[PDB]
Design a protein around this ligand. Sequence first.
Ligand code: HEM
Ligand SMILES: C[C@@H](c1ncncc1F)[C@](O)(Cn1cncn1)c1ccc(F)cc1F
Length: 528
Amino acid sequence: IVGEALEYVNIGLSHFLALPLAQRISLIIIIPFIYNIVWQLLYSLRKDRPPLVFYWIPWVGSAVVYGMKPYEFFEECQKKYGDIFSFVLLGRVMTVYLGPKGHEFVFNAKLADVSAEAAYAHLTTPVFGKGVIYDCPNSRLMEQKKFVKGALTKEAFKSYVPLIAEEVYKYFRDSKNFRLNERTTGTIDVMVTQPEMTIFTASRSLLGKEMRAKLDTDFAYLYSDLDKGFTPINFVFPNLPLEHYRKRDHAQKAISGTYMSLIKERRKNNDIQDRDLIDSLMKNSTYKDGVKMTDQEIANLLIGVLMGGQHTSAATSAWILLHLAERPDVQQELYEEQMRVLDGGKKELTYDLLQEMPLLNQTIKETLRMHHPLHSLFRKVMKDMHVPNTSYVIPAGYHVLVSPGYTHLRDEYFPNAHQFNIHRWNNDSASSYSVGEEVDYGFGAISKGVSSPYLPFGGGRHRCIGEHFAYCQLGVLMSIFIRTLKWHYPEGKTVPPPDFTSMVTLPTGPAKIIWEKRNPEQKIGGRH
Ligand code: HEM
Ligand SMILES: C[C@@H](c1ncncc1F)[C@](O)(Cn1cncn1)c1ccc(F)cc1F
């Protein structure tokens, strides 16, 4: 007789529903703790799954160590399990594939196998607005990228160089952090100066003079509010009836409103030129099926493009200054190249002359090797994926994570990888090189292979289209920094470690350097 036992299941259920509140909340905690632990041990025997990093807390997973020190986490997991392994992160399973094979597996994955917008839309759609980037099918994104890349031409860069130069000189003249007509030395926090210089230079060139003029007013604080809404917290908590979220949504509406105002003023006056990215998208933003982007979608695409470029570029010029601050030898070598290429300063800097500055471009290239601004790129797996030359299957509903910034730091691919050495790029100063066959996904021919161990701009359909703009901006900025200033660390300070929590690998601030004028008597003209 088992019937007697099934009575005691029923009895035990009734004795359970009647335990003291102390016993039950303790049971409410301990039942999923134990179940999680036993599920992982059962998981460890599936041979069609990559090894899964062990974690104590359910749902949270390895979120803490991953969020704080992702590269240290990857190295420890790589020593234990090899190059492919999974970990739990705030409710999701992330499968990491380290190394060049990982780059191929993720960046060159079939469109049907993985979805970037399914991973990212919750981060970005609340910040940028609807209908663009990741709030739209991949085919729409592919053509959005074509539209933006159409104002990112060599001819556009030739006109952007003197405009970016003007902004840098105006920032040296007017900003409280410098005031070079009044002060010959000073101390700056590069995490204060570089965000400002980046937004001023990117606004003037990509958005135009009107939009740049608005950053001289209270309007600039909307950018700070919108910027604060770009945060990993959006991945778990993208809308909370709280104040941070309200200034974000307000800023998005107010900034996109300002761009639509300009777009509609330009069209009401037929004042549509080739000045900036606004002119360009107004003339060129009709999809191949004949649908035109709305003025709202144009404005939102501007926000996302300007904000993406904001955080990668500002982080990078911060790291460049910070590495050069302890390398007066490198500053000296870069200064000599400035003097030779620009005839002692008697040539005005042009886009063409920037391309004849290999050591300056190698300094950018080397900073992007040691400080890849995005430590992790993500996709959501949409169809079960087999990992070649293994028995592993990554099931739909998992996410795949690739980290070229981690391979940038491996000695096997970059000897003495933790040493800043711009000369490892001698006779190889190009921002990136397609090492063979090319493919076009809708925004131009790009490298078909994505196996390069140096992959600062990703690859495949989601590859960056901002690299030449970033080199132009960083190049103008650094050419002027080098010709105008020397700089060094306060006593006993050195390169700060990265803060990875922002998802952008920023220097831990305050990161202070001391500048001094190379020509204490040099004056910057213009009105102020
Ligand atoms: C140092 C500067 C930069 C670095 C290292 C960088 C890095 C990257 C990487 C790694 C990706 C691939 C993302 C993924 O696969 O999920 C990407 C995509 C992209 N980036 Fe950049 N970026 C930089 C600057 C810029 C700038 C200046 C702009 C705009 C002016 C920009 C706009 C974009 C866009 C539109 C994409 C396409 C995303 C997609 O197709 O899903 N980036 N970038
Ligand atoms: C999604 C986002 C990101 N941020 C942080 N970790 C991983 C990421 F994928 C990012 O790739 C960053 N970025 C890349 N180039 C410039 N910015 C991005 C892409 C396109 C865009 F229009 C705006 C934008 F923020």
